[PDB]
């Protein structure tokens with residue numbers, strides 16, 4: 001009887017950070033309450049100043065990472081303020097029935113809804129908006145995020161021993177399809193209805209104009225670089241709601257990787273690069289062994305370094321010359 | 334001595350249905366006899382009325398699913414009627430030697446051939462036409478299907494316990510490359526030889542114009558939606574002979590998935606989405622838990638909802654409010 | 667203390683051949699010394715005579731396969747002769763720290779450097795040039811190879827029993843992006859700086875003009891076809907530093923496949939086709955069972971047979987009619 005269960009209210013945080021949680025469940029099953037407010041907003045996505053009309057959960061691209069345990073109930077209050085112009089909904093890949101919730105959560109501007117589902121399968125999962133007839137337009141406008149459903153006894157390695165992270169980040173990767181004119185310059189639009197046919201035409205090229213982490217070129221760099229210390233265990237959750245990606249930590253590895261995100265399966269070990277299919281979340285566990293700057297990319301390097309799918313880690317600590325050293329520094333002889 | 338084995342004649346059915354078979358082999362090894370007749374035919378592939386010259390096994394795109402057991406012999410009589418114009422052949426990814434049979438099955442119009450091979454490896458496998466010098470043109474004209482080679486003791490889970498399906502469907506996914514003029518409209522052609530250079534040019538874009546299930550936009554919808562009941566175990570075999578896909582059951586999961594189709598490997602559990610590489614068949618097992626309409630898609634949602642890679646299930650039964658419920662229906666407050 | 671270890675000098679060979687090594691380590695850990703000389707050179711990559719300015723390690727596309735054992739130290743002397751025009755460096759996906767070595771190996775023309783790293787994880791791994799701000803341009807000019815790090819006790823199957831190859835080949839697959847004019851013809855350039863913006867524009871299409879094995883259309887065919895005998899065990903290492911591929915042995919299988927290349931994981935069995943993500947090396951083990959010609963392809967068949975990603979094996983020995991036979995040869999009746 002769900003009314004006899006504890007309720008716990010979660011207050012979400014902006015990606016790539018993740019709201020506080022316990023790896024190992026410290027209670028029995030709970031109804032875990034979340035609220036998200038849909039926000040249609042202009043976003044500048046590149047260094048050139050290209051501005052799109054983003055469709056967001058909670059103001060961000062991606063939407064925030066939600067975290068529960070297996071056989072908790074997720075109860076989401078989804079708000080679509082009357083400041084928005086479009087109908088929206090939500091499909092959880094973690095959920096069972098009604099198109100993952102999309103059939104039950106259609107909210108016009110000025111409406112709200114509350115959906116509850118049981119998180120019966122452990123893993124990281126995509127969630128995304130999916131309004132009938134307009135699904136890829138919403139998703140590729142940034143209206144997607146992820147949910148992690150931890151096993152109640154936390155993560156385990158390929159032999160059944162615990163894997164405990166010290167830090168977790170969520171990297172949402174977004175393919176955008178900004179319409180172009182015949183000369184190649186990005187077009188802009190005065191209403192969503194006036195944009196729609198050209199959005200469809202741009203999507204049908206299957207060629208993104210931009211592929212970004214955390215909503216913009218360079219978002220996870222500089223003052224917003226990811227951080228870690230030597231010897232810290234870091235879980236990077238990575239989602240792509242629409243298109244394949246191939247994550248890679250430049251200078252590191254995925255020590256344990258669930259490339260298709262589902263924790264009942266043993267992880268793949270020692271990965272250089274892995275394939276997260278479009279429509280999937282994956283998760284990589286790494287223990288840092290060297291300080292300095294790392295890049296974290298989609299290893300189609302064009303997608304990374306020309307189209308935006310690249311972020312950085314700044315790692316503190318001592319350098320290990322046993323693991324790597326310059327024997328003879330670059331010089332002319 | 335193969336002449337001392339039983340022979341069994343199979344009569345194929347049109348996808349997405351699958352001819353009758355036993356999961357667990359009820360006989361010893363057999364020579365399993367199949368006949369397919371090649372048919373070149375016009376097909377309308379979209380809602381707009383776009384008509385292509387399809388190249389088919391047995392009249393359908395995809396070709397029918399053939400089913401045998403491990404260490405049976407497949408004996409295929411391949412007929413190319415003199416009503417056809419082209420040379421064709423067949424390559425089984427399940428077979429060993431002679432380019433999978435393609436070197437031994439070259440049939441001009443008005444010829445036939447009979448190939449026999451031993452099905453030594455269990456799995457779902459692509460079969461496709463592959464005439465030297467014209468391979469992607471035949472494949473991307475729809476001239477491909479799949480063959481399932483069941484283990485003699487049926488399917489097993491990741492712990493070695495039986496998995497038995499109640500229903501099986503075969504979803505063939507086809508990338509088409511309909512040539513376009515400079516303005517973007519589809520071109521048509523008076524002979525295959527007059528089409529060939531423009532077919533090659535369209536293919537070399539690597540950008541399909543259409544990506545469809547069972548030969549056409551909307552083929553697995555309406556009166557041809559897939560069906561199941563709550564609690565039924567369903568195996569969906571999915572092939573893509575030329576290009577990657579990423580299947581997803583909207584509202585469900587792949588409870589057990591052989592993403593690259595080979596049953597000696599333990600399945601992946603609880604998948605949201607999985608990657609079937611171009612040139613591969615995969616298979617997903619699911620137990621339905623909720624009634625209603627599901628969509629089954631390639632989760633590049635552009636490929637799904639703009640280019641055609643989407644079908645539906647209609648599922649009967651009782652709704653489980655424990656698994657999902659609307660707590661507060663969409664309303665303004 | 668690394669100075670107390672044996673040093674062993676390796677003399678590399680041109681792909682697809684692989685320098686001599688022991689599967690099972692016949693010594694303790696060693697410092698394994700390699701030297702590579704960077705060569706910028708013109709290469710003709712297709713049958714039409716299309717000439718690009720390639721950027722190579724040791725004169726070849728791909729660069730040579732390096733082979734060590736787990737917990738050996740790789741010591742690479744990288745030479746950039748003053749006959750070259752560009753700055754280059756090297757990133758090993760096998761290494762830990764400093765962007766895989768790229769931060770420590772920046773060599774202008776007329777410089778050299780020596781990098782040492784510990785090969786702490788067993789697998790096949792990409793190595794590639796990666797100069798800050800110019801990474802995909804160098805990689806997609808051919809400046810990439812692979813390194814195999816064998817377990818000290820050699821390869822093992824999914825049950826822990828030895829897998830020993832008789833022969834090994836390295837197939838480097840290269841996506842090129844030759845700039846095109848408005849009419850579709852390839853452009854040429856008088857200096858690297860004059861080429862750069864058009865190289866970036868061509869890359870941003872995400873549509874390769876050519877996809878080749880061993881540096882050119884048809885490179886692994888004819889007098890340079892791969893060879894084997896019936897009953898020989900063959901390991902094919904396959905890399906793709908920038909873009910996904912889907913290898914397939916036409917007429918065979920991958921009996922044991924590490925699709926993402928890391929030997930601590932059990933291999934996938936009986937694969938028809940597998941996905942090697944861009945930025946990864948994979949490895950397939952097969953025992954040949956039939957003589958004759960095989961094709962080895964990227965099973966996007968357009969990429970294979972139109973864009974160049976296809977090679978051949980010539981296999982000697984006796985034909986097995988139990989495994990495959992023509993029962994009735996193609997004829998009219």
Ligand SMILES: O=N[O-]
Pocket residue numbers: 248250251299757758759765766796
């Ligand atoms: O290894 N850096 O792509």
Ligand SMILES: O=N[O-]
Pocket residue numbers: 091092093099100130581583584632
């Ligand atoms: O979850 N529907 O793409």
Ligand SMILES: O=N[O-]
Pocket residue numbers: 424425426432433463914916917965
């Ligand atoms: O099976 N040949 O693509």
Ligand SMILES: [Cu+2]
Pocket residue numbers: 055087088089129130131138143
């Ligand atoms: Cu929306």
Ligand SMILES: [Cu+2]
Pocket residue numbers: 091093126128279581583632
């Ligand atoms: Cu979805």
Ligand SMILES: [Cu+2]
Pocket residue numbers: 388420421422462463464471476
């Ligand atoms: Cu054909």
Ligand SMILES: [Cu+2]
Pocket residue numbers: 424426459461612914916965
């Ligand atoms: Cu094939």
Ligand SMILES: [Cu+2]
Pocket residue numbers: 721753754755795796797804809
């Ligand atoms: Cu370089």
Ligand SMILES: [Cu+2]
Pocket residue numbers: 248250299757759792794945
């Ligand atoms: Cu790299």
